Amino acid sequence: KKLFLVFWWHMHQPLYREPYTGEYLLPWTFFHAVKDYYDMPAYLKDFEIKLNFNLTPVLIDQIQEYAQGKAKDVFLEAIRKDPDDLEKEEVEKLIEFTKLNYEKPIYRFERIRELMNKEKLNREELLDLQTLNLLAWCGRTLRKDLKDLLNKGRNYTQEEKEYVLNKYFEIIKKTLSIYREIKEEGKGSVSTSPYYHPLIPILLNPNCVYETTPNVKIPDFAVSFREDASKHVELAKEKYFEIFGEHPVYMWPPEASVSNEALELYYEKGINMLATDEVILKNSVERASPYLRYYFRELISVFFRDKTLSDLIGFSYHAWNAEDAVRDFIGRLKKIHESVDFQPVVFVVLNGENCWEYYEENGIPFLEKLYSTLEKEEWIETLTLEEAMRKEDVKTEVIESVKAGTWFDGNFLKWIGNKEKNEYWKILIEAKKKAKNDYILVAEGSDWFWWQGEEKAPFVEVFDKLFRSFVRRAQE
Numbered sequence: 001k002k003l004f005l006v007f008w009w010h011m012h013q014p015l016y017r018e019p020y021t022g023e024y025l026l027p028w029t030f031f032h033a034v035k036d037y038y039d040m041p042a043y044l045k046d047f048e049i050k051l052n053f054n055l056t057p058v059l060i061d062q063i064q065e066y067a068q069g070k071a072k073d074v075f076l077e078a079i080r081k082d083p084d085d086l087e088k089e090e091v092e093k094l095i096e097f098t099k100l101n102y103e104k105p106i107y108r109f110e111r112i113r114e115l116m117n118k119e120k121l122n123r124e125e126l127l128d129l130q131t132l133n134l135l136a137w138c139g140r141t142l143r144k145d146l147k148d149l150l151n152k153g154r155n156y157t158q159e160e161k162e163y164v165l166n167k168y169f170e171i172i173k174k175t176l177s178i179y180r181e182i183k184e185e186g187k188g189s190v191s192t193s194p195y196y197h198p199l200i201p202i203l204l205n206p207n208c209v210y211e212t213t214p215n216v217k218i219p220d221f222a223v224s225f226r227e228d229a230s231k232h233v234e235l236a237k238e239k240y241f242e243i244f245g246e247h248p249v250y251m252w253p254p255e256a257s258v259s260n261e262a263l264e265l266y267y268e269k270g271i272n273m274l275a276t277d278e279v280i281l282k283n284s285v286e287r288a289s290p291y292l293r294y295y296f297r298e299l300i301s302v303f304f305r306d307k308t309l310s311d312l313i314g315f316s317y318h319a320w321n322a323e324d325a326v327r328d329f330i331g332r333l334k335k336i337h338e339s340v341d342f343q344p345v346v347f348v349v350l351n352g353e354n355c356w357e358y359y360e361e362n363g364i365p366f367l368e369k370l371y372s373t374l375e376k377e378e379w380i381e382t383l384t385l386e387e388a389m390r391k392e393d394v395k396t397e398v399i400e401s402v403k404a405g406t407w408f409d410g411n412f413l414k415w416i417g418n419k420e421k422n423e424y425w426k427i428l429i430e431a432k433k434k435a436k437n438d439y440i441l442v443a444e445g446s447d448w449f450w451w452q453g454e455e456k457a458p459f460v461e462v463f464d465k466l467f468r469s470f471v472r473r474a475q476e
């Protein structure tokens with residue numbers, strides 16, 4: 001009797017490319033590509049397990065632009081330039097980026113503490129600031145290849161910085177190839193999401209928010225977004241087809257968000273399986289175990305992720321010693337394995353790129369320990385999404401209805417319902433009345449709605465500029 005374990009790492013970035021200037025206004029796609037988007041599947045070169053990945057189409061677009069050398073990234077230019085060539089504004093951007101990342105373990109360089117305590121930085125000090133910002137985001141592969149430059153920790157030259165930059169772009173250029181390879185070799189399945197990561201249930205029926213939060217205020221949805229919901233799905237199928245040669249059979253619904261209407265739409269567009277959140281299951285069925293394969297109306301297969309295990313990795317274990325965290329995770333799997341008569345299916349689903357910057361050494365001790373341990377536990381079998389979808393010796397259940405929601409507490413309050421988030425929806429609704437091109441789809445991404453109210457969110461002025469620029473461009 002085995003326990004079936006399914007990792008599904010979700011990779012996504014909103015479009016940071018300003019449509020009028022073509023400039024990438026934030027470097028987050030660059031830094032997560034060099035740190036995470038190649039290196040997370042690249043663990044499969046060293047560990048004999050299965051790991052699955054979701055890539056959103058808008059992320060794939062940006063990875064391609066960087067790999068082709070076409071991305072004009074404003075923060076990266078401030079890093080690349082000889083400090084003598086820096087604008088005052090670029091020096092300011094470098095310093096503020098450092099300040100906003102200073103406390104993360106991946107920024108744990110003595111030289112950074114030195115530089116940030118200096119009243120004034122000369123050329124050699126700025127060169128170190130530039131190069132250490134680059135190296136702070138170094139991924140697992142290049143942390144070994146560039147270990148000597150990392151251990152320097154200071155006194156970098158322009159040549160050395162340029163060497164690191166070239167190696168970083170090599171990693172980006174190999175990134176889509178590694179997803180194809182692990183897919184073709186059967187080491188993992190690759191899924192995608194509706195194109196710009198929107199909240200499909202709201203686009204189909206904004207009143208679905210009242211299924212869980214009756215007291216929320218929402219704006220007057222005076223236009224229909226139902227066709228756009230279809231377009232997000234169809235365009236995502238086409239993008240995946242371009243990259244991998246086949247249409248996608250699995251999708252990750254953004255924010256784990258489902259509803260009866262959304263599940264019907266995924267079915268109608270030919271999607272065979274998705275996953276969503278355990279809280280949705282609890283809200284939808286009086287007594288239900290998350291370790292079964294569910295069939296929604298016999299139309300589409302649904303797995304509900306194990307929220308505790310997913311949250312332990314995403315939120316908890318950065319604060320633990322790495323062996324203890326792995327011991328805790330395996331011990332929880334042991335309890336699941338011993339608690340049921342059948343073979344349970346355990347979905348661990350979370351973002352694959354955002355938690356590691358808070359772990360010691362970029363989560364590498366944790367993941368190397370975890371994967372090394374997993375491959376040696378005879379009673380755990382890790383599965384691709386394909387294997388989980390088709391596995392015969394598991395328990396199944398049919399369900400007829402779900403209560404619409406997301407993995408945020410089973411509801412939509414992270415993106416709608418306060419005065420400021422609703423203002424953005426009003427802007428989008430009014431722009432949709434006059435939209436003439438697919439930039440209105442870009443503006444429907446969930447990324448433009450989560451930060452309104454999150455005191456503590458860095459660069460919200462840039463997100464506001466991007467959203468409003470996409471909305472204006474959509475009407476031309």
Ligand SMILES: OC[C@H]1O[C@@H]2O[C@H]3[C@H](O)[C@@H](O)[C@@H](O[C@H]4[C@H](O)[C@@H](O)[C@@H](O[C@H]5[C@H](O)[C@@H](O)[C@@H](O[C@H]6[C@H](O)[C@@H](O)[C@@H](O[C@H]7[C@H](O)[C@@H](O)[C@@H](O[C@H]1[C@H](O)[C@H]2O)O[C@@H]7CO)O[C@@H]6CO)O[C@@H]5CO)O[C@@H]4CO)O[C@@H]3CO
Nearest residue numbers: 012013014028255351354408414446447450456457458459
């Ligand atoms: O929009 C920019 C953002 O885009 C993508 O993130 C998506 C993500 O792909 C979606 O799945 C979803 O994420 C969930 C998270 O899974 C969930 O954990 C939670 O996220 C909260 C964090 O846990 C919490 O720590 C805090 O986030 C901080 C974050 O720690 C800071 O580092 C900083 O985030 C910046 C990122 O560093 C930067 O890479 C980029 O983020 C991308 C992200 O990489 C990409 O995957 O920009 C952000 C902002 O500058 O600040 C934040 C805020 O203080 O709070 C978050 C949100 O509550 O919930 C989200 C939403 O359900 O959605 C995100 C965002 O759309």
